[PDB]
Amino acid sequence: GAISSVLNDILSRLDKVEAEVQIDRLITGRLQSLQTYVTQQLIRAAEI
């Protein structure tokens, strides 16, 4: 839901107040994407 996926593109085109509203998304979406990977790897590690 950010205006771009490229982190530097968000910074190249927005001011230090409006950028954070876009960056919080990329952070919250990426952070969720890691928590899914690590949960799936702990469950695979439990099988191995």
Binding site: L7, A19, I27, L34
Partner: protein, 49 residues
């Protein structure tokens, strides 16, 4: 008997070479240390296995 050990740099993944992103990531507290601790736990266990 094992699988590939992986360490994921949670700051470089989320905020790749952005300092202003890294200052926002710090607002979420320990989650990158929890992810690093979990993947280190898996990695140490592949040698134990």
């Amino acid at each position: 008997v094992s699988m590939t050990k992986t360490s994921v740099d949670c700051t470089m993944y989320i905020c790749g070479d952005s300092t202003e992103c890294s200052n926002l990531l710090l607002q979420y507290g320990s989650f990158c240390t929890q992810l690093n601790r979990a993947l280190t736990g898996i990695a140490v266990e592949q040698d134990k296995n």
